[PDB]
Each structure stands twice: as structure tokens, then as C-alpha cells.
Amino acid sequence: NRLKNEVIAITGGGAGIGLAIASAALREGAKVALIDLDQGLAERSAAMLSTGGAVAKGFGADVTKAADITAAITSAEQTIGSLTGLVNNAGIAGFGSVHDADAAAWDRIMAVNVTGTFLASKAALAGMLERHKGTIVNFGSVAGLVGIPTMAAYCAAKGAIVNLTRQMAADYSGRGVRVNAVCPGTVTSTGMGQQLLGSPEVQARRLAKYPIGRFGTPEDIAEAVIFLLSDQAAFVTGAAFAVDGGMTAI
Amino acid sequence: NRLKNEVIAITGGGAGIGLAIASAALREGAKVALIDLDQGLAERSAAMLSTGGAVAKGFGADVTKAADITAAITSAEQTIGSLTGLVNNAGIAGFGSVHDADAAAWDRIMAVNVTGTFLASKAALAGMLERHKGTIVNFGSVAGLVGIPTMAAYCAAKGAIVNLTRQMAADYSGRGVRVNAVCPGTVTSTGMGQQLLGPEVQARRLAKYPIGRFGTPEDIAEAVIFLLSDQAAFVTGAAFAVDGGMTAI
Amino acid sequence: NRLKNEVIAITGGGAGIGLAIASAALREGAKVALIDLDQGLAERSAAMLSTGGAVAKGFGADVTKAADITAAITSAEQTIGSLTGLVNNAGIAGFGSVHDADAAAWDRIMAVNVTGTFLASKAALAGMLERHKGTIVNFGSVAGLVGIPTMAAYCAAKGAIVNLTRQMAADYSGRGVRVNAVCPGTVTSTGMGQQLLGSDTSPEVQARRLAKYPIGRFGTPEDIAEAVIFLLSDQAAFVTGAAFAVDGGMTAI
Amino acid sequence: NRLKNEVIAITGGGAGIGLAIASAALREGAKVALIDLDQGLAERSAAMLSTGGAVAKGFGADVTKAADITAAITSAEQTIGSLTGLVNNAGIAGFGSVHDADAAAWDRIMAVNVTGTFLASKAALAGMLERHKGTIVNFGSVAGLVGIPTMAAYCAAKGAIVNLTRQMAADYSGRGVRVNAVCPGTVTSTGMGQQLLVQARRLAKYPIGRFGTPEDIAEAVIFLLSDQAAFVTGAAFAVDGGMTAI
Ligand SMILES: NC(=O)C1=CN([C@@H]2O[C@H](COP(=O)(O)OP(=O)(O)OC[C@H]3O[C@@H](n4cnc5c(N)ncnc54)[C@H](O)[C@@H]3O)[C@@H](O)[C@H]2O)C=CC1
Ligand SMILES: NC(=O)C1=CN([C@@H]2O[C@H](COP(=O)(O)OP(=O)(O)OC[C@H]3O[C@@H](n4cnc5c(N)ncnc54)[C@H](O)[C@@H]3O)[C@@H](O)[C@H]2O)C=CC1
Ligand SMILES: NC(=O)C1=CN([C@@H]2O[C@H](COP(=O)(O)OP(=O)(O)OC[C@H]3O[C@@H](n4cnc5c(N)ncnc54)[C@H](O)[C@@H]3O)[C@@H](O)[C@H]2O)C=CC1
Ligand SMILES: NC(=O)C1=CN([C@@H]2O[C@H](COP(=O)(O)OP(=O)(O)OC[C@H]3O[C@@H](n4cnc5c(N)ncnc54)[C@H](O)[C@@H]3O)[C@@H](O)[C@H]2O)C=CC1
Ligand SMILES: C[C@H](O)CSCCS(=O)(=O)O
Ligand SMILES: C[C@H](O)CSCCS(=O)(=O)O
Ligand SMILES: C[C@H](O)CSCCS(=O)(=O)O
Ligand SMILES: C[C@H](O)CSCCS(=O)(=O)O
Numbered sequence: 001n002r003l004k005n006e007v008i009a010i011t012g013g014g015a016g017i018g019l020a021i022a023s024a025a026l027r028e029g030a031k032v033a034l035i036d037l038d039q040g041l042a043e044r045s046a047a048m049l050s051t052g053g054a055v056a057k058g059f060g061a062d063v064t065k066a067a068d069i070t071a072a073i074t075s076a077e078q079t080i081g082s083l084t085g086l087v088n089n090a091g092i093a094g095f096g097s098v099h100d101a102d103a104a105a106w107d108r109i110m111a112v113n114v115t116g117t118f119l120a121s122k123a124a125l126a127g128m129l130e131r132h133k134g135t136i137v138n139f140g141s142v143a144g145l146v147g148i149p150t151m152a153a154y155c156a157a158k159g160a161i162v163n164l165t166r167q168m169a170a171d172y173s174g175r176g177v178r179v180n181a182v183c184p185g186t187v188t189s190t191g192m193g194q195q196l197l198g199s200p201e202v203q204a205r206r207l208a209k210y211p212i213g214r215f216g217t218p219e220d221i222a223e224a225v226i227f228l229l230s231d232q233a234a235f236v237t238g239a240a241f242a243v244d245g246g247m248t249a250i
Numbered sequence: 251n252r253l254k255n256e257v258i259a260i261t262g263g264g265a266g267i268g269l270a271i272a273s274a275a276l277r278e279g280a281k282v283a284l285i286d287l288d289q290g291l292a293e294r295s296a297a298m299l300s301t302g303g304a305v306a307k308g309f310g311a312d313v314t315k316a317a318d319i320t321a322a323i324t325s326a327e328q329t330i331g332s333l334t335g336l337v338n339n340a341g342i343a344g345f346g347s348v349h350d351a352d353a354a355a356w357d358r359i360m361a362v363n364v365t366g367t368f369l370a371s372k373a374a375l376a377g378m379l380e381r382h383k384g385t386i387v388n389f390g391s392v393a394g395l396v397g398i399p400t401m402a403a404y405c406a407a408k409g410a411i412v413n414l415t416r417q418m419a420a421d422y423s424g425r426g427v428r429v430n431a432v433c434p435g436t437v438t439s440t441g442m443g444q445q446l447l448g449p450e451v452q453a454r455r456l457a458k459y460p461i462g463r464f465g466t467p468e469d470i471a472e473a474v475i476f477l478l479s480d481q482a483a484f485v486t487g488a489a490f491a492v493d494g495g496m497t498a499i
Numbered sequence: 500n501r502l503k504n505e506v507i508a509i510t511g512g513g514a515g516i517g518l519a520i521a522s523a524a525l526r527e528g529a530k531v532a533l534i535d536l537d538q539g540l541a542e543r544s545a546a547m548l549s550t551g552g553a554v555a556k557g558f559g560a561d562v563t564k565a566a567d568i569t570a571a572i573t574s575a576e577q578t579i580g581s582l583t584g585l586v587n588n589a590g591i592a593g594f595g596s597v598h599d600a601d602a603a604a605w606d607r608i609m610a611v612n613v614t615g616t617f618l619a620s621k622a623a624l625a626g627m628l629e630r631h632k633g634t635i636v637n638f639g640s641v642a643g644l645v646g647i648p649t650m651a652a653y654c655a656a657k658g659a660i661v662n663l664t665r666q667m668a669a670d671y672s673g674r675g676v677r678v679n680a681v682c683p684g685t686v687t688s689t690g691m692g693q694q695l696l697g698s699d700t701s702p703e704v705q706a707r708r709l710a711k712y713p714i715g716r717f718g719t720p721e722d723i724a725e726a727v728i729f730l731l732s733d734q735a736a737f738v739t740g741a742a743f744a745v746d747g748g749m750t751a752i
Numbered sequence: 753n754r755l756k757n758e759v760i761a762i763t764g765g766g767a768g769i770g771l772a773i774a775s776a777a778l779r780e781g782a783k784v785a786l787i788d789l790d791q792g793l794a795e796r797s798a799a800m801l802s803t804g805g806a807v808a809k810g811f812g813a814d815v816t817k818a819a820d821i822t823a824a825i826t827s828a829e830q831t832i833g834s835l836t837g838l839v840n841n842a843g844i845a846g847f848g849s850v851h852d853a854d855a856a857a858w859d860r861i862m863a864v865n866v867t868g869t870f871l872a873s874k875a876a877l878a879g880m881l882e883r884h885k886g887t888i889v890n891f892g893s894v895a896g897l898v899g900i901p902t903m904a905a906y907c908a909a910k911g912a913i914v915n916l917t918r919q920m921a922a923d924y925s926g927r928g929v930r931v932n933a934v935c936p937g938t939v940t941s942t943g944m945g946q947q948l949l950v951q952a953r954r955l956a957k958y959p960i961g962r963f964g965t966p967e968d969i970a971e972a973v974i975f976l977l978s979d980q981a982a983f984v985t986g987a988a989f990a991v992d993g994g995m996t997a998i
Pocket of ligand 5: 093141142143148184185186187192196206209247
């Protein structure tokens with residue numbers, strides 16, 4: 001019951017890491033809102049999770065669209081109660097170095113990751129600040145802390161999220177709202193993870209970047225997020241928490 | 251659940267943050283060994299904690315003395331079982347800038363913090379590596395990540411611990427032993443906290459903390475309990491700031 | 500003559516830190532192209548700088564407009580020779596926290612800073628990679644390393660630039676192109692510096708800000724320019740992927 | 753003339769990166785004191801550098817011995833003038849992990865690196881603070897910023913130096929003394945580079961595609977020592993071919 005009486009909205013919550021966060025949050029007694037670009041997916045996943053009295057509801061919204069994400073958060077609050085937590089998990093990845101990157105793809109990557117974190121937080125902060133109570137978890141990556149070959153836009157976007165997290169902590173920590181970023185290492189099993197992988201030598205070069213000797217699971221990342229959401233993390237704010245199997249330590 | 255079947259040794263566990271870690275670890279089902287310079291204190295604190303079937307044991311050792319810390323860990327394991335976790339919480343602080351610091355006090359601060367982390371870990375690692383299973387939590391500080399006026403030796407020591415943690419993670423993460431550092435902001439209530447305090451200046455210190463308050467031993471303990479737990483299975487080499495936003499600004 | 504035979508393009512080169520970089524680069528023997536949103540300013544400043552044999556030329560371009568910045572770099576190269584260095588100095592700042600920031604303002608700050616760095620680098624990289632030779636200096640800030648109250652978009656943009664610099668260094672350092680970021684502390688005398696002051700008039704906050712700087716003063720455009728000159732020079736041949744704090748100690752405490 | 757009117761003491765100045773710093777500082781018009789554990793080497797290297805009117809002098813001291821290093825700095829100041837810069841270049845490396853490192857070996861690595869930086873700085877700071885003018889460059893490493901397998905003591909020592917640099921800058925920047933740390937990537941050609949010389953695995957960690965040279969590192973130190981770096985203090989400057997960027 002680490003999240004007893006918490007109400008948590010999770011963007012990109014219909015699949016992958018976001019869904020695992022939802023599962024773990026329900027385990028700890030939270031009520032959860034899954035907000036996804038894919039409304040049907042959010043609804044199906046919410047139903048799948050709604051067992052043993054667990055309360056999970058699905059909502060459709062593109063985080064880059066101010067009116068849509070605002071309406072989704074308002075509806076979540078109307079449906080399951082005033083938010084105590086927001087997880088800005090929605091993100092997309094793509095490839096392209098600065099010299100040849102698709103400019104339109106660049107903008108979309110920056111939009112979903114950075115603008116989405118901005119707009120979703122903006123919607124949630126009205127109530128959280130009014131209540132002097134909230135916790136926001138943003139999604140960095142190892143790709144926001146170091147450079148990754150061939151991922152210019154994504155490294156820019158995640159770098160933005162890491163420092164935006166510090167900025168938001170600066171504004172809001174004293175007003176009762178903690179803001180932190182989890183920075184995951186590679187997680188193989190998700191759609192994005194599969195996109196990333198998509199030769200014994202190449203993948204092995206990648207695996208060699210991880211002292212722990214394996215890549216992450218959605219469940220590994222979810223546990224870190226649940227800690228940050230919980231009131232046991234009451235003094236934790238502005239942190240960029242590396243959950244990365246040692247990648248950024250070497 | 252969350253530390254069911256864990257066996258945790260905590261250096262400097264007789265008081266302050268170390269004692270809070272012990273209490274929280276017992277809450278989560280671990281068995282704990284308090285290892286403190288002050289043997290009597292370790293014993294009294296262990297006795298106080300050992301209620302409701304909670305198992306805590308106290309041992310005396312100076313972490314800077316290789317034979318003594320090795321013996322305490324051996325005794326702990328005989329009494330509560332093979333270690334699954336080590337918290338290198340033992341540390342001391344002091345004041346003095348580079349131009350005027352006393353060399354002997356400098357050496358003692360470096361010894362307790364850095365050499366203690368080295369020797370305690372060395373002792374624990376024999377067993378942990380043999381079993382391919384362990385978690386070590388070292389104690390950095392905000393003082394290991396940024397410069398603090400008038401605390402040269404302490405900033406050096408905590409800076410050493412932060413990067414030694416990365417180095418240890420590099421060596422051992424693939425061999426079944428995770429190594430992480432908690433980097434706490436100021437916690438005023440402990441013996442060390444009271445030492446650092448000893449009002450315009452207080453208010454200036456408080457303004458360094460976006461959250462608007464200093465930390466408690468319980469705040470820090472919860473982060474340590476997370477890092478010790480198998481729910482942190484992918485977390486290694488991290489320098490985790492538990493600091494009310496201090497290093498974020 | 501630390502930049503003899505170098506040809507450097509400087510975005511936002513018409514005024515402020517960019518103009519100070521131009522002046523120092525000319526001192527060290529480079530030829531410089533000033534590229535600024537304000538074409539007249541770029542041209543007037545280039546004229547002012549072109550004394551004693553120094554060669555500076557001005558060009559107008561909005562760094563957020565791919566065709567415009569590409570055209571400016573092309574004209575610059577036709578005028579003063581193939582680029583060996585690019586300084587992505589153009590940037591704008593503004594105020595607003597996540598809860599109240601205007602989305603359009605947010606986008607423009609992200610565009611000039613992040614998209615501008617992307618688009619100008621893209622233009623310069625074609626030639627630099629072909630020649631296996633270049634150095635790119637991006638502009639972070641203390642605001643790209645730590646959080647600054649009430650500057651959400653700007654902290655996001657500068658944070659993007661700091662890590663984009665790492666990413667570009669990862670791609671290009673082995674191909675002959677070094678990429679680094681200078682992260683200046685507050686420089687009061689520029690238009691942006693004045694913009695920052697003007698945003699809070701109290702002298703408690705004014706002295707509060709200065710107390711963040713161990714060195715006991717704010718930066719000058721000349722202070723920042725010297726670090727950029729070092730990074731552009733071949734004396735910095737092993738320096739790449741660095742986020743170099745030039746900040747009077749601000750991020751050290 | 754970037755260091756004209758500067759007087760710079762360089763610990764470990766008899767060889768390797770230290771000697772390269774001396775050479776570049778003399779190129780820029782500074783007067784240099786080489787301070788080395790090997791006194792004869794400091795003297796011979798100083799003599800070699802002292803051509804074309806350049807002023808370099810050699811002195812012997814173990815930076816871990818307070819009286820030794822204090823006496824060398826005092827002798828230096830008496831011979832070439834009051835210090836304006838100090839480069840804490842002296843350092844040693846070794847191998848050993850936490851589980852197997854010998855405690856005496858651990859202590860000597862910490863001593864030369866960390867205690868040496870403390871003691872040499874303590875000696876120089878008396879004069880620098882009196883004159884409200886100084887610049888101190890400490891030696892970190894990529895090994896002070898990230899973990900390096902099998903180098904526990906060395907990663908601890910360099911980690912200490914990186915944050916001690918921030919601490920010193922906090923204390924002294926407003927009093928006229930800048931303090932910075934250079935953090936070099938691997939430099940193969942020095943005694944330490946050779947000592948620490950799978951090898952293709954190591955090179956792959958460097959995006960620039962080569963290891964550093966003593967000259968590469970010297971140029972960064974020269975910048976940090978110069979008055980052109982007037983606003984630079986408290987910084988950990990990575991000179992590392994991109995190693996810590998990935
Ligand atoms: N998978 C990995 O290796 C790592 C991923 N991450 C970050 O973790 C987060 C989640 O990653 P994954 O679970 O792997 O992603 P995913 O690709 O498996 O799923 C992302 C979910 O977000 C939704 N989504 C996409 N765009 C959206 C938008 N504009 N508005 C609302 N929802 C949208 C998708 O529909 C999808 O259901 C992202 O921020 C990602 O960048 C960070 C580090 C490692
Ligand atoms: N109190 C604070 O504001 C902060 C403290 N810390 C670190 O957290 C850790 C714990 O701090 P506190 O609880 O405040 O300390 P404390 O001073 O309240 O208690 C520390 C305990 O360590 C023991 N100890 C001292 N030297 C020892 C040695 N050589 N061998 C074995 N045990 C020894 C003492 O007997 C004492 O019981 C330390 O590493 C400290 O540096 C870090 C950040 C904030
Ligand atoms: N002034 C300060 O305190 C600090 C400033 N900086 C950064 O340093 C850089 C330069 O700063 P300042 O000299 O103070 O700025 P400034 O405001 O004095 O001058 C900026 C120049 O950039 C030009 N510019 C603006 N938008 C442009 C665009 N879209 N395309 C082309 N040119 C454009 C302007 O016309 C102007 O001439 C910026 O990247 C800034 O964010 C970073 C840290 C400290
Ligand atoms: N060689 C490399 O790959 C890198 C080395 N470094 C650091 O750069 C610095 C210089 O390294 P190198 O030039 O390679 O070293 P080096 O081994 O080639 O020579 C260092 C000099 O320091 C002197 N020295 C050793 N102990 C001393 C003591 N207790 N007191 C006074 N002098 C002493 C030696 O006699 C020698 O002349 C060191 O601090 C080192 O840790 C850091 C990163 C890369
Ligand atoms: C997409 C996710 O943030 C991972 S980016 C690549 C990280 S690594 O595989 O190069 O360690
Ligand atoms: C003793 C502990 O590590 C705190 S060091 C001083 C930190 S602060 O009060 O200057 O934020
Ligand atoms: C606009 C420039 O990047 C400075 S942002 C504010 C930095 S400080 O004055 O709060 O230290
Ligand atoms: C001794 C010097 O600080 C280098 S430590 C090893 C660095 S690397 O070769 O593993 O990148």
C-alpha cells in the first residue's frame with residue numbers, strides 16, 4: 001500500500017513501460033488513469049488491469065495537443081479523483097544525425113517528448129499547486145545524459161527533459177510538488193525497444209555498455225517510478241535517477 | 251517484502267541516519283547488523299530495535315581498522331546469516347579550507363569516509379562475490395557533488411565516494427553485486443547535523459533547498475531501503491540525490 | 500595567430516557575445532562571417548570589425564529557417580572561403596514556468612536555440628564532413644546544467660543543446676569534426692543580460708543573483724569569447740563533446 | 753605572450769604531461785618552476801627547456817610531505833618570483849579493485865593525488881591570497897568522472913580531486929584565486945600511460961579515434977592558467993577525445 005489514496009495519470013500508459021508503471025501502481029493501491037494517443041489501447045489495457053478491485057481507466061489524448069491533453073487530465077480527475085501524481089512517460093524515438101536528419105521527424109520527436117511533458121504538466125499543475133500536493137515523474141533516458149550515435153533529435157529531446165525537470169523542481173518543490181526524472185537504460189521488450197534493435201557483434205557492442213550484463217525490463221523501470229511517486233520519496237526532488245544497469249557510470 | 255530474506259550490515263548503524271536505515275530495513279523484513287565505532291551504542295540500539303520478532307544485532311568496529319571491520323562482519327554473519335547487503339554509512343565531517351586545514355584531521359576525515367568504505371566493502375565482497383549476490387550502498391552527500399565553503403577534506407572524501415561507487419559498479423555489477431551511492435542533503439537532527447549547525451547563516455543554508463526544509467534521517471533511509479531491495483535490480487552505479495532539490499539548482 | 504587560416508561563421512554574430520567572439524577571432528587571424536536575424540546589424544558590425552586588414556562580412560538569416568541559414572553559409576563560403584568553424588551563438592530567452600508559460604513563446608525559444616543549432620550545423624556539416632575538418636561550438640548556459648526559476652522553455656532548450664553537443668561529438672569526432680558547448684554564467688551587458696535584469700527590479704533579488712557566483716561578479720562578453728576562441732583553435736584538438744562551464748563558479752556550488 | 757608576467761609552479765614537472773605544460777607555459781612567456789619527486793630530473797628537464805631566454809628552474813619535493821613541498825615552493829619563489837599559478841600535476845596510478853587492493857598501495861595513490869594536491873595548494877595559497885591573485889589547476893582524469901575497471905584507488909583519488917576543485921573554487925574565487933581541474937583522457941606516451949598499457953577495446957571508448965598527447969593536455973592547462981580564463985573557476989574541463997560524452 002505504498003500508493004494508498006494516490007491518483008496517478010500516466011501518459012503513454014497503454015503499452016510498454018507506461019503499462020508496467022500502471023500495473024505496479026495498482027499493486028501499491030493507487031487509482032490510475034492511462035492516457036494514450038491510442039484511445040482503444042488505453043481502454044483495453046485499463047480493463048485488463050482492473051482486477052481484484054483495482055481501479056484503472058483509459059483516456060485518449062495526444063500529449064502535443066494542449067486542448068486534448070488538458071481535457072484528458074480533467075476527465076481523469078472527474079473519473080477517479082484529483083491527481084496526486086503525473087508520469088510523463090509518452091515519448092517517441094527516431095534516428096538521424098544532425099547532417100541528414102529528417103527535420104519534420106525532428107520536430108515530432110521534440111514535440112512528443114518535450115512539448116508533451118510541458119503541456120501535460122501544465123494541465124496537472126493547476127490542481128496540484130492549488131492543493132499544495134503533487135509528484136511529477138518525467139522520462140529522461142541514458143540518451144538524455146550522454147550522446148548516442150545517430151540519434152540527434154532524441155538526445156536533444158531527452159536532454160531537454162532532464163534539465164526541464166531540474167527547472168520544474170526549482171519552481172515547485174517549495175510549493176508542495178516534487179519533480180524528478182527517471183533515466184532508463186535500454187529496455188528491449190517494448191515497441192520502442194524493438195524499434196531500436198530493428199549481428200552477434202553489433203548488439204553485443206551495445207550490451208557491453210551495460211556493466212550489469214543485461215538490458216532493462218519494463219518492470220525494472222516501473223519500480224523506480226513507483227518509488228519516486230510515493231511519499232517515501234518526500235525529500236527527493238530535482239533528481240535525474242539513472243536506472244540503467246551502470247551504463248552512465250562507466 | 252520488501253527486504254524479506256535480506257541480511258544487511260550497516261556501518262555507523264548505532265545512531266543518526268544509520269539507525270533510521272536499520273529501523274526501516276527491519277520494517278521491510280530484513281535482519282540487520284549495526285556496526286559502530288561505539289560498541290555499547292550498537293548493542294543498545296540493536297536491543298531497542300529487536301521487538302516484535304525483529305532481529306537486530308550490534309557489533310563494535312572502527313571501519314578504518316581492517317582486522318576489526320572484518321571481524322565484525324564475520325561475527326554478524328555467524329549471528330544473522332550471510333550478508334546480502336552492506337550500507338557504508340559510517341562517516342565523519344569537519345571544517346577547514348585548503349589553506350588552513352589541519353593535515354591530521356584531513357587524514358581522519360578521508361580515512362573514515364573513504365578508507366572505511368574501501369575496507370568494509372573489501373570484507374563484505376569476499377562472501378558476496380562467492381555467492382554472486384549483493385548490494386552495497388555508499389554514502390556520498392551533496393558535499394560530494396558540489397563544493398561546500400570551509401569543508402575541504404569532507405568534499406574531497408565525499409567526492410571520492412561518489413566516483414569510487416561508479417568504479418565499484420564497473421567491477422562488480424556483472425558479478426551479481428550492485429553498488430550505488432545515496433547523496434543526502436543536510437539532515438539537521440543527527441549528531442553530525444548538530445555539529446554542522448554549531449541564524450542569518452541558517453536561513454542562507456535553508457535557501458539552498460528548493461523544497462524549503464532540511465532532510466530527516468527517515469527521508470534518507472527510504473532511499474537506501476529502495477536501493478537495497480530487489481525492486482532496484484537494474485539500479486547500479488547511481489549517485490542518487492536525496493537532497494530536496496539542492497543539486498538541481 | 501591562434502586562428503590563422505580559419506574561417507569561422509558565427510550565428511547571432513551582430514551583437515553581444517557573438518560580436519565579442521568575432522572580435523577575438525579576428526584578433527587571432529581568422530576570417531569571420533557574422534550571420535544574424537538582423538541583416539543590417541550583421542553588416543554594420545562586420546564593417547566596424549574590418550579594420551587593420553581584418554576580414555569580417557555580414558549576412559542575414561533566421562537560424563530557424565533551413566533555406567535561409569543554408570543560403571547564408573553558402574554566401575559566406577563564396578565570400579571568405581570554406582568554413583573551418585561554426586559558432587551556434589544565436590539564442591533567445593524568455594520567462595514562464597510550466598504552469599503558465601505561453602505555448603507559442605515556448606516553441607519560439609525551443610526553435611531559435613535547439614532547431615537553430617540543428618539547422619545551422621546541418622548546413623555547415625556538409626562541407627566540414629567532406630573536408631574531414633571542422634569545429635562546432637554550441638551555446639549552452641548555466642541554465643542548461645541547472646534549473647533556473649521561471650525559465651522553463653529556456654532551461655529545456657539549453658538542456659537540449661548540452662546533450663545534443665554530446666550526441667554530435669559521438670557522431671562526428673572520428674570524422675574530423677569536434678563539437679563542444681560553452682555554458683556561460685550570466686553576462687549582464689548584452690541585450691539578453693538586460694532582458695534578464697529588467698525582469699525583476701528588487702535589489703534583494705539582484706544581490707541574491709550575484710551571490711550565486713563565487714567569483715563575485717557576472718561575466719563579460721569578452722570572458723565568454725576567450726573560451727570559444729580556445730575551443731575553435733587547433734590547440735583544442737583533443738577537446739570534443741565537452742560542456743565547458745564559463746560561469747564564475749556558479750555550477751560548482 | 754599569453755602568460756607574460758606569470759610565474760607557474762608545476763608539480764611532477766620533470767616528465768610527461770607536467771613537462772609538456774612547462775614547455776607550453778614558457779612558449780607563452782611564463783617563468784616556470786618544475787617540482788618533482790626526482791630532483792635530478794626536475795633540474796635536467798629545466799635545463800633542457802631553458803633556451804632562447806626562457807626561465808625554467810628545477811626543485812625536488814615529495815608533494816605528500818608538507819615541509820618538503822612548502823620548502824620547494826618557497827625556494828621557487830625566491831629564485832623566480834612570487835607564484836601566480838600552481839599546477840597540481842603530480843599523481844600516480846595503480847591497479848586493484850576494492851575486493852583485492854592492498855591497503856598500503858591504496859594509501860599511497862590517495863596520498864600523492866589527493867594529499868599532494870592539498871599540501872601543495874596549502875603552500876601556494878598563503879602568497880596567492882595575500883596578493884589576491886592566483887590560478888590553480890588540479891589534475892582529475894576521465895577516471896575521476898566515471899568508473900574504470902580494476903582502478904579503485906585511482907578512481908577514488910581523481911574523484912576526490914574533481915570535487916575538491918569545486919570546494920576550493922567555492923572558498924577562493926571571490927578572493928582572487930581561480931581553481932579548476934583538467935580531466936584528461938588516456939595519454940599513452942608518458943610513464944603512466946606506458947605503465948597502464950583489449951587495447952582496441954580501450955580506443956573504441958574514444959570518439960575522436962585516438963588517445964591524447966601530453967601537448968593536447970598542456971594546451972588546456974595553459975588556457976586555464978591565463979588571464980583570458982578570468983571567468984573560469986570551479987570547472988572540471990574534460991580534455992578526453994569525447995570519452996565522457998558517450
Ligand atoms: N524502451 C527503451 O529502451 C527506453 C525508453 N525510454 C522512454 O520511456 C518512455 C516509454 O518508452 P516505451 O515504453 O519503450 O515506449 P513505447 O513505444 O513501447 O510506447 C509508448 C506509448 O506512448 C504512446 N504515445 C506515443 N506518442 C504519443 C503521444 N503524442 N501522445 C500520447 N501518447 C503517445 C504510444 O501510443 C505508446 O502506447 C518514453 O519516454 C521513452 O522515450 C527511455 C529510455 C529507455
Ligand atoms: N547529517 C547530514 O547532514 C548528512 C550526513 N551525511 C553522511 O551520512 C552518513 C551518516 O551521517 P549521520 O547519521 O548524520 O552521522 P552521525 O554523526 O549522526 O552518526 C554516525 C555514526 O557513525 C559512527 N562512526 C563514526 N566513525 C566511525 C568509524 N570510524 N567506524 C565505525 N563507525 C563510526 C558514529 O559512532 C555514529 O554513531 C555519513 O556518511 C555522513 O557523512 C551525508 C549527507 C548529509
Ligand atoms: N547574456 C547571458 O547572460 C547569457 C547568454 N547565453 C547564450 O549566449 C548566446 C548569446 O547571448 P547574448 O549575446 O546575451 O544574446 P543577445 O540577445 O545580446 O544577441 C543575440 C543575437 O542573436 C540574434 N538572433 C536572435 N534570434 C535569431 C535567429 N532566429 N537567427 C539568427 N540570429 C538571431 C539577435 O539578433 C542578436 O543579435 C545565446 O545562445 C544565449 O542564450 C548563455 C548564458 C549566459
Ligand atoms: N597518462 C595518462 O593517461 C593520464 C594521466 N593523468 C594525470 O595526469 C598527471 C600526470 O600524468 P603523467 O604525465 O602521465 O605522469 P608521469 O608518470 O609520466 O610523471 C609524473 C611525474 O610526477 C612525479 N611524481 C610522482 N610522485 C610524486 C610525488 N609524490 N611528488 C612529486 N612528484 C611526483 C614523477 O616523478 C613524474 O616525473 C597525473 O596527475 C595523472 O594522474 C590523468 C589522465 C590521463
Ligand atoms: C531509446 C532508449 O532511450 C535507448 S537509446 C540507446 C541507449 S544504448 O543502447 O546506446 O545504451
Ligand atoms: C554534512 C552533510 O554532508 C552536509 S554538507 C553541507 C551541505 S549544505 O548545508 O551547504 O547544503
Ligand atoms: C540567460 C542566461 O543563460 C542566464 S540564465 C540565469 C542564470 S542566473 O543569473 O540565475 O545565475
Ligand atoms: C590514468 C589515466 O587517468 C587514464 S585511466 C583509464 C582511462 S580509459 O583508457 O579506460 O579510457
